[PDB]
Each structure stands twice: as C-alpha cells, then as structure tokens.
Amino acid sequence: MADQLTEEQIAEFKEAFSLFDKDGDGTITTKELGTVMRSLGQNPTEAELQDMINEVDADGNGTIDFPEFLTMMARKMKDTDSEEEIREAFRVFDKDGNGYISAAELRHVMTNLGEKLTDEEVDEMIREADIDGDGQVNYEEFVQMMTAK
Amino acid sequence: NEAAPEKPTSASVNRYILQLAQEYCGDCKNSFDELSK
Amino acid sequence: CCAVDPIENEEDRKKAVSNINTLLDKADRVYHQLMGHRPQLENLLCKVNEAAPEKPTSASVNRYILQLAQEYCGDCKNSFDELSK
Amino acid sequence: GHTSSTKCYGCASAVTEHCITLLRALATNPALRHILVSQGLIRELFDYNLRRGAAAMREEVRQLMCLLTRDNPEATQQMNDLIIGKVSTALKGHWANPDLASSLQYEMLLLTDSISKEDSCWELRLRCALSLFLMAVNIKTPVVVENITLMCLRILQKLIKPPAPTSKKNKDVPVEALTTVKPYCNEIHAQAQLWLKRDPKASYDAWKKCLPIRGIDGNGKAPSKSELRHLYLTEKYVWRWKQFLSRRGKRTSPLDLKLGHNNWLRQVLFTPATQAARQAACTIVEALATIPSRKQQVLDLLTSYLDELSIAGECAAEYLALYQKLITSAHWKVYLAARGVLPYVGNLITKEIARLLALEEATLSTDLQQGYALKSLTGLLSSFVEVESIKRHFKSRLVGTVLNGYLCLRKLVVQRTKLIDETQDMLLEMLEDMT
Amino acid sequence: NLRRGAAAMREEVRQLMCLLTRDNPEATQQMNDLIIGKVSTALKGHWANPDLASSLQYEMLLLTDSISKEDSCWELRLRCALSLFLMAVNIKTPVVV
Amino acid sequence: SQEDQLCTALVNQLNKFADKETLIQFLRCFLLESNSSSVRWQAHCLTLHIYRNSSKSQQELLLDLMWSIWPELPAYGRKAAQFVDLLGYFSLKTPQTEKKLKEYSQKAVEILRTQNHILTNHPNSNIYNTLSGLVEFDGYY
Amino acid sequence: SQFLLTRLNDPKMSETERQSMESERADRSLFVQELLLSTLVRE
Numbered sequence: 001m002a003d004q005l006t007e008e009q010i011a012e013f014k015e016a017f018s019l020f021d022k023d024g025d026g027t028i029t030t031k032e033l034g035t036v037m038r039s040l041g042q043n044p045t046e047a048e049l050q051d052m053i054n055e056v057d058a059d060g061n062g063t064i065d066f067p068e069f070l071t072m073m074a075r076k077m078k079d080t081d082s083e084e085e086i087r088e089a090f091r092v093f094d095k096d097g098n099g100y101i102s103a104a105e106l107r108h109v110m111t112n113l114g115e116k117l118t119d120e121e122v123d124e125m126i127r128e129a130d131i132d133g134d135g136q137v138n139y140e141e142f143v144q145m146m147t148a149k
Numbered sequence: 150n151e152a153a154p155e156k157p158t159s160a161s162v163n164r165y166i167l168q169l170a171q172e173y174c175g176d177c178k179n180s181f182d183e184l185s186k
Numbered sequence: 187c188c189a190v191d192p193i194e195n196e197e198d199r200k201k202a203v204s205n206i207n208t209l210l211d212k213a214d215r216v217y218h219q220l221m222g223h224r225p226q227l228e229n230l231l232c233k234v235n236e237a238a239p240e241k242p243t244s245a246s247v248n249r250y251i252l253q254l255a256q257e258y259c260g261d262c263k264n265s266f267d268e269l270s271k
Numbered sequence: 272g273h274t275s276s277t278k279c280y281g282c283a284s285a286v287t288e289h290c291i292t293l294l295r296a297l298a299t300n301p302a303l304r305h306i307l308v309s310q311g312l313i314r315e316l317f318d319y320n321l322r323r324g325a326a327a328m329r330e331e332v333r334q335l336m337c338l339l340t341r342d343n344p345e346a347t348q349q350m351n352d353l354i355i356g357k358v359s360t361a362l363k364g365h366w367a368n369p370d371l372a373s374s375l376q377y378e379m380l381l382l383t384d385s386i387s388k389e390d391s392c393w394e395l396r397l398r399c400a401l402s403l404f405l406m407a408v409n410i411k412t413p414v415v416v417e418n419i420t421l422m423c424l425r426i427l428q429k430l431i432k433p434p435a436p437t438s439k440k441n442k443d444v445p446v447e448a449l450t451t452v453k454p455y456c457n458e459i460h461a462q463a464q465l466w467l468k469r470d471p472k473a474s475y476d477a478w479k480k481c482l483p484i485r486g487i488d489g490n491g492k493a494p495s496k497s498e499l500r501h502l503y504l505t506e507k508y509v510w511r512w513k514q515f516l517s518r519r520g521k522r523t524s525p526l527d528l529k530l531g532h533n534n535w536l537r538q539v540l541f542t543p544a545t546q547a548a549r550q551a552a553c554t555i556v557e558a559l560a561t562i563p564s565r566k567q568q569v570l571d572l573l574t575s576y577l578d579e580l581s582i583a584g585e586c587a588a589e590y591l592a593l594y595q596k597l598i599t600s601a602h603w604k605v606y607l608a609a610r611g612v613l614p615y616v617g618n619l620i621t622k623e624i625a626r627l628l629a630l631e632e633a634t635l636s637t638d639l640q641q642g643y644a645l646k647s648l649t650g651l652l653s654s655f656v657e658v659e660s661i662k663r664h665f666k667s668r669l670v671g672t673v674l675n676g677y678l679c680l681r682k683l684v685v686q687r688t689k690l691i692d693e694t695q696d697m698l699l700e701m702l703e704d705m706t
Numbered sequence: 707n708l709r710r711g712a713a714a715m716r717e718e719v720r721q722l723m724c725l726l727t728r729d730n731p732e733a734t735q736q737m738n739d740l741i742i743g744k745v746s747t748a749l750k751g752h753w754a755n756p757d758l759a760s761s762l763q764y765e766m767l768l769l770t771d772s773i774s775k776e777d778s779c780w781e782l783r784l785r786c787a788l789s790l791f792l793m794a795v796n797i798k799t800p801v802v803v
Numbered sequence: 804s805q806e807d808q809l810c811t812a813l814v815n816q817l818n819k820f821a822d823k824e825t826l827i828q829f830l831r832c833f834l835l836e837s838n839s840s841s842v843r844w845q846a847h848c849l850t851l852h853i854y855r856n857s858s859k860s861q862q863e864l865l866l867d868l869m870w871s872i873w874p875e876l877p878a879y880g881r882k883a884a885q886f887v888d889l890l891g892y893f894s895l896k897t898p899q900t901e902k903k904l905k906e907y908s909q910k911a912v913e914i915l916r917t918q919n920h921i922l923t924n925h926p927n928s929n930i931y932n933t934l935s936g937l938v939e940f941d942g943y944y
Numbered sequence: 945s946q947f948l949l950t951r952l953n954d955p956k957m958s959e960t961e962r963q964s965m966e967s968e969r970a971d972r973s974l975f976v977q978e979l980l981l982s983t984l985v986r987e
C-alpha cells in the first residue's frame with residue numbers, strides 16, 4: 001500500500017524518525033508523535049493527532065516503530081479523499097440515516113463541535129449548498145461539494 | 150535658548166544657567182522682600 | 187609616556203602575554219562599569235525634559251540638572267580616562 | 272487687606288488649581304460629565320493645562336481628562352484624534368528638529384493613563400496606540416524609539432500580559448486557562464489592516480463570534496474511538512464547507528499562519544537606541560508563543576534572525592536570552608535540528624572566524640566586544656548538541672567544521688581575548704565529545 | 707547644520723547659506739520659502755505650545771543675516787521679512803513679540 | 804442621643820432668624836477673607852454641619868449662595884481651598900435639576916477659560932515658563 | 945486629611961464580577977495577541 005511513495009520520501013521519513021529516536025531502539029513515544037511529521041512541513045490539528053494515535057495504537061502502549069509509521073504517512077499526501085471517508089462523513093451528518101441532512105442535524109453537530117451560529121447563517125449556507133432548489137443536501141450534492149476546487 | 154555647547158561637578162553646569170539662577174533667586178528675591186516689607 | 191619593557195627571549199614573551207591578558211580583563215571590567223551608566227542617564231534625561239517646577243545661589247539650580255552634571259562629567263569621565271589609559 | 276492684585280501670576284495659577292480640583296470633583300456625576308464634555312472642556316484641558324503647572328497638577332489634569340471619557344465613545348474619539356494629530360504633525364518634522372519628538376511626552380503619558388484604566392471604550396484607545404506604533408516603528412532615529420515606540424510597546428506589553436488573578440477560584444490557574452474561546456490551530460481570524468480602518472465586519476465582537484467556546488469538561492470519561500473519528504471528520508468537513516462558502520459567498524476569509532521573514536519585529540528586537548524596547552519586544556514575542564502552532568512560526572522567525580548576531584554584537588543579549596528559553600525543551604531542539612539549523616550555525620561560525628582572521632592579519636585596533644557573537648554561536652551549537660539524538664546522528668557532518676574552526680582559532684596570536692579563549696576551549700571539548 | 711554644533715560652527719553655516727544665495731533669485735526664493743513655511747507651521751500651534759515660538763531663533767537669525775548683507779536680491783528678502791511681520795504683528799502672546 | 808434633635812432644633816432656629824445677606828457675609832468673612840487656616844477649618848466644619856441638619860429648601864438656598872459667591876474667587880487666591888471643597892461636596896450631594904447643573908458647569912468652565920487666557924498672555928509668562936524648568940524658586944518676584 | 949473631596953475614590957468589587965473581569969482580561973489578551981500576529985504574516 002506504500003508502493004506509491006517515491007524512494008526519497010521513504011528516505012526522508014527514515015531521516016525524521018531516526019532523528020526523533022530517543023533511546024536508539026528504532027521506536028519513539030506517542031507524545032512526540034505529532035512533532036515528527038509535524039516537523040516535515042505538514043500542519044495537523046489535535047483531533048487529527050488523537051485520531052492517528054487511535055488508529056494504530058490499539059494496544060494502548062503509546063509507542064510507535066517504523067512500519068506503522070510508514071502506514072500512517074502513506075495516507076497523508078493524498079488529495080482526492082477516499083469515497084469511503086466522504087460516505088462516513090455523510091453518515092455522521094445524517095444522524096437519523098434518512099440520507100438527507102436537514103438544518104437540525106447540522107445544528108446538533110455544530111453545537112457538538114462547540115461552534116455557535118445563527119439560524120439565518122445556517123439556512124444561508126444550506127441554501128448555498130443546494131443545486132436542485134429543494135433546500136436539502138444529499139449524497140450527490142455532498143460529493144460534488146467536496147470535489148469542487 | 151540657543152543651547153550652544155560650551156567647553157570648560159557643580160561647576161560643570163552651563164554658565165548661563167548659573168547666571169540665571171544668581172540673577173533671579175539671588176538679587177530679584179532680595180529686592181522683592183525689601184519691597185514687600 | 188606609555189611604554190613597556192622590551193622582549194629579548196621567550197620568558198619575556200610569556201610575561202608579556204600574561205600581562206596583556208590581565209590588562210584586557212581589567213579593561214573589560216572598566217568597560218562594563220562605564221556602559222552601566224547609560225540607563226540612569228536616560229532616566230535623568232526623561233525627568234529633565236518634563237521641566238516640572240520644583241520648590242526648594244548655585245544650589246538653586248534644578249536638582250536633576252545637578253545630578254546630570256555629576257553623573258556625566260564626574261563619573262563617566264573618570265571611567266573613560268581609566269579605560270583610555 | 273484681603274484682596275489680591277488684579278494682575279498676579281500666583282493668584283491666577285491658584286485659581287486654575289482650584290478649578291481643576293472642582294472639575295475633578297464634579298466629573299464623578301455622569302450627567303455633569305456629559306454636560307462638561309459638551310461644553311468643550313477636553314480641548315481646553317488638552318491645549319493649556321497639560322504642560323503648565325507643577326507635576327502634581329499635571330497628573331491631576333491627566334486624571335481629569337481620562338475621567339471625562341470614562342464611557343463616552345465620542346469623547347474618546349475626540350481625545351484620540353487630538354493625540355494622533357499632534358503626534359503625526361510632530362513626527363512629520365522630527366527629522367529636521369529633535370524637540371518635536373522630544374516634546375510629545377505628555378500626549379503619550381495621557382494615552383498610557385487612558386489605556387491603563389479599564390473601561391468599555393478600550394478598543395478605540397488600543398486602536399490609537401497600535402496606529403501610533405505602526406506609524407513610528409520603522410524610524411531609526413533614537414529619539415523616536417525612546418519617545419514613541421517604547422510607550423506603545425509598554426502599552427502592548429501591559430495588554431498582552433494581564434495582572435495575576437486575585438479571585439479565590441482562580442488563585443492558582445494561569446492566564447491561558449481562563450479564556451472563554453479557543454483559537455484555531457492554523458488560522459488567524461483577527462485582521463489588523465481592516466481593523467485599523469474601522470470595519471464593522473472586523474471588530475472585536477465579530478472576531479469573538481467566529482471562535483468556538485471552551486468546552487466545560489464536566490465529564491472525565493474517555494471518549495470512544497467512534498467519538499474521536501466523528502470529531503475528526505466533522506471538524507474537517509465543516510472547515511471545508513466554511514472555506515467553500517468564503518470562496519463563493521460573502522463570509523470573510525481567515526488568513527493563514529505563515530509569518531514573513533522581514534518585518535518590524537527585527538527592527539525592534541535589535542535596536543541599539545535603547546534596551547527597554549528590546550526587552551519589551553522579547554516579552555511580547557514570548558507571550559505570542561503559547562500554543563505550539565504559533566510557537567512554530569515564532570521559533571522559525573527567531574532562527575531566521577540568527578545571522579544578526581555579528582552586526583549587533585552586545586545588543587543581541589536579550590534576543591539570545593529569549594531564544595534559549597523557547598528551545599529549552601528537548602523536542603523543540605530536535606525539531607530545529609530536523610529543519611537543518613546545524614549547518615546554518617556552523618556556516619555562521621566559520622564565516623565569523625574567517626572575518627576574525629582577516630582582521631587580525633591587517634590591523635591592530637582593539638574591540639572590547641570581540642568574540643561575543645562567536646561565543647554565543649558556539650554555546651548555542653553546544654546546546655543543540657548535548658542531547659543524545661542529534662549528537663549520535665549529526666556528528667559525521669560537523670567534525671570538519673569544528674576542527675577547522677579550532678585550528679583557525681589556535682592560529683590567533685595577537686587579536687585574542689577571553690571570549691576567544693573560552694570559544695576555543697568549548698570547541699576542543701566538542702571535538703573530544705564527538706570523537 | 708543650522709542647529710547642530712558649537713556656536714561658531716552655527717554662525718559659519720549661516721554665513722555659508724547666505725553666501726550661496728548672493729545673486730541667485732531662485733536660491734533666495736527657496737531659502738525664503740523654507741523660512742516662511744517653518745515659521746508659519748510653528749506659529750499655527752504657538753498658542754498650544756510656547757516652544758514652537760521659542761524655537762525659531764535660528765530661522766530669524768538667518769533672515770537677519772541675509773538682509774544685513776547688501777546684494778541684488780534685497781527685494782525678495784524684504785518681502786519675506788515684511789510678510790512675517792504682518793503675519794505675526796497682531797498676536798498678543800509675549801513669546802511671539 | 805438627645806444632642807441630635809437639639810442640634811436640629813438649633814439649626815432650624817438659626818435658619819429662621821438669619822437672612823441671605825448675613826449668611827453671605829459669614830461665608831465671605833470666615834471662609835475666604837480669613838488669613839488664618841484654623842479659622843477657615845472651623846468655618847468649613849460649621850458650614851458643613853449647618854448644611855447637613857437643614858431641610859432641602861435651605862440646602863438649595865445655601866448652595867445657590869455659594870455658587871453666587873464663586874465668581875468672586877480670583878480676589879482671594881490660595882485662601883479658598885475649603886470653600887471649593889465645600890462647594891464641590893454640596894454640588895455632589897444635593898439632588899438638583901438639569902438647568903441648575905448646566906449653569907454650574909458653565910460657571911466653572913467660564914472661570915477656567917478666563918484664567919487660562921490671563922495666564923497665556925501675561926507679560927511675565929515667558930520668563931516664568933522658561934525659568935520653571937531650570938531653577939527652583941518659590942514666588943514670582 | 946480633612947478634605948471631603950479627596951475621599952471620593954471608593955472602588956469596591958465583588959467576587960463574581962471579579963471572575964468576569966479576569967475572563968474578559970484573558971479574552972482581550974488573546975485578541976491583541978491575534979491582532980499582533982496578523983501584522984507579521986507573509987505578503
């Protein structure tokens with residue numbers, strides 16, 4: 001799955017991992033896990049970091065070595081998001097599973113995020129996310145929204 | 150007011166400032182006190 | 187005149203090197219002492235600029251001007267002369 | 272025998288003192304405050320009584336003028352307009368007359384007192400202070416730096432770093448633990464260019480409305496794996512939705528956290544006119560680096576500033592003392608090493624050693640600050656090296672530089688000081704540690 | 707150089723500036739324009755700051771020296787002096803007088 | 804606690820007997836024209852306690868009397884610290900209408916403006932202004 | 945000490961408003977930090 005990455009990128013990832021090795025065993029701790037590819041020129045968020053820790057550190061040891069490090073990095077430079085990821089985001093937005101994300105579920109998710117907005121603003125963003133004129137976003141609308149560049 | 154630098158520590162103050170102090174606080178004060186009396 | 191003993195052999199060179207190191211250390215100490223005066227000078231400059239009237243003949247001059255004269259022409263001059271020597 | 276002379280200076284001065292005291296007493300009533308400010312009292316107190324009288328009377332009129340604008344935006348705007356106009360008029364011809372810059376101290380003192388008193392019109396006074404700062408931050412003349420930029424930097428320093436809390440509930444927690452909003456990691460929503468032009472869409476409340484609240488973590492339960500996944504992509508795609516809305520709609524577009532490598536920060540941090548300006552700039556930049564995302568850019572810019580050690584030898588004493596504090600942790604050192612700062616420092620050391628040799632060959636003049644920059648750079652390299660990862664990894668590329676520098680320094684015979692000797696000792700210790 | 711240096715250097719630069727306009731109407735006009743502009747700018751805010759009137763002595767000394775030396779551009783210097791006179795003759799403040 | 808109503812009764816008696824001119828003369832004689840300061844402090848206390856124990860109408864009458872005396876302030880110079888203290892306290896404590904407030908503020912600002920004009924055109928103003936920042940002196944000789 | 949007008953400065957504040965003031969100071973410090981950061985961005 002990591003064959004799409006050119007050899008110099010593997011070399012520079014090994015460079016970063018080795019420089020970030022503490023005890024010389026080829027294994028680092030997860031507290032500085034952010035700093036490693038954080039030092040390579042990419043900019044993550046804390047939710048990104050905790051999700052990345054969760055995905056690999058299933059045993060809860062909090063310690064990472066090279067193969068799964070390459071596993072994480074191989075899924076970072078991709079620009080076109082995998083349709084499974086977009087579909088799962090659609091499902092998360094579609095709490096009731098009806099396939100249509102009305103304003104109310106959007107309000108619930110935005111309040112869960114901690115962000116506050118007015119009813120007029122969310123109605124406005126919903127109506128600018130609608131192409132069929134029904135004022136209701138669906139899977140095709142979401143996909144064509146995320147593919148817009 | 151011209152503040153021209155002058156070349157030569159209580160004696161190192163500008164001579165014109167010393168003259169101003171002597172003329173005002175030394176003589177005018179005496180004259181004012183006599184006049185008030 | 188400012189002159190030092192001449193050098194004729196190696197032990198004299200060693201003595202000269204040691205003496206020059208000692209003189210450099212003394213010069214550094216005097217230099218730091220001299221350059222320490224500047225913050226007080228700028229504080230007195232800012233105070234003088236306000237020109238606030240003060241109530242109490244050479245003693246009737248403003249006290250901040252007297253302090254400026256004492257600090258500059260009395261102490262900085264001595265430090266500068268020692269450093270030059 | 273109880274009547275004063277008609278033309279008496281002292282009696283008129285005393286009447287003015289009594290007038291100021293009575294007006295200060297009267298101003299404590301809001302209605303009388305409004306009537307007085309409507310009479311046209313601010314301009315009168317600005318034009319005459321600011322500079323005339325004893326020092327106590329001058330601070331009293333400053334207090335009265337501050338009080339007259341306690342909660343009146345129009346009065347605050349009028350006072351700010353007067354201050355800004357006078358400062359700009361003086362600063363236009365500061366270059367042809369130093370007194371114009373040297374005779375602004377009461378205006379700036381009034382601004383300092385106005386900002387130091389917490390009131391509801393703080394934003395306008397902050398705008399005035401920041402406008403005066405950005406108008407006179409690039410002037411090299413020492414009188415402007417001592418009389419304009421210092422006061423603005425002290426105002427900014429007081430605003431960024433508030434006093435320690437005294438409430439019994441918050442007697443221990445630091446200032447970063449009290450904010451009611453959480454700034455975004457990689458975005459800046461405040462924009463000064465629009466703010467300084469009085470844009471309602473770029474105000475303080477508008478900025479606060481765009482930031483999520485700090486979640487009251489009343490439950491200590493560890494969120495499940497699905498919860499973290501949901502949080503992740505919800506944040507991701509909400510951000511993408513907002514980005515598209517800004518791209519097509521009318522919502523403002525936040526700026527990206529990428530700092531420029533040339534700025535006023537470099538002017539202020541190494542100014543030789545005064546030291547308090549450098550110290551205030553150090554405090555400001557230290558306060559600007561709290562969340563690691565901003566500390567990224569702060570440390571990168573400060574590393575970019577590394578080449579100034581030679582030009583501003585002792586004036587860097589503050590700057591270095593901050594850099595070492597910001598990289599005092601191991602992971603920041605190894606991050607900087609990963610970005611390629613070791614060859615940079617080595618090249619700087621070699622260049623300044625070559626300059627030292629070239630100067631030694633030709634002339635015989637003395638310099639009491641010789642070797643300070645080299646001493647600092649070698650100490651910084653040792654600081655980077657002592658940690659085990661970089662020492663084990665970066666030894667094979669730095670041996671040549673260290674040995675060449677040590678031999679070149681040993682060649683010195685006349686232009687030698689204590690700093691050069693200490694540098695040679697540290698370089699030899701480096702060589703013995705690496706081999 | 708008008709305000710910096712010892713008094714002898716200041717009078718020397720005054721003499722040099724006077725000599726540079728010995729028979730040049732354009733140079734005389736430029737010098738007069740500078741003097742008039744500075745005096746008017748200071749006198750606009752003299753009422754709110756006495757130093758503005760108290761810190762014009764070198765400009766007026768330059769004008770005095772320029773007029774005191776008989777040359778062919780005397781009319782322009784007289785015009786500058788009379789304009790400054792009629793601009794600041796009705797002000798009661800003692801510093802202006 | 805009898806002294807409270809005794810003081811109230813005596814204050815009402817004095818207010819009943821005394822007219823405007825007598826109170827005006829008392830103020831001018833023992834708050835402004837007195838060279839001593841102990842007498843001025845005694846008058847300050849006595850005026851304050853006459854004001855406190857009076858009714859609203861007499862309080863307004865006394866405040867108006869003091870605001871009528873105030874324009875004569877320059878003739879007394881430094882001697883009117885207690886007078887302006889009492890005037891400020893009375894104007895701050897007595898509840899009063901808007902027109903009276905505007906009149907009072909106008910009087911204060913007018914006196915301030917006139918004194919500023921006197922200061923900035925004084926023949927000796929330049930000399931004193933320059934001497935202030937160089938020498939230390941008590942009076943204007 | 946006998947002057948009445950010199951005692952007019954009597955500032956007092958309770959505890960809840962003290963927490964509110966501390967939170968507001970923190971918010972304003974964050975705002976000025978962001979505003980200063982906005983001026984150093986790359987152009």
Ligand SMILES: [Zn+2]
Nearest residue numbers: 275279281282
């Ligand atoms: Zn008098």
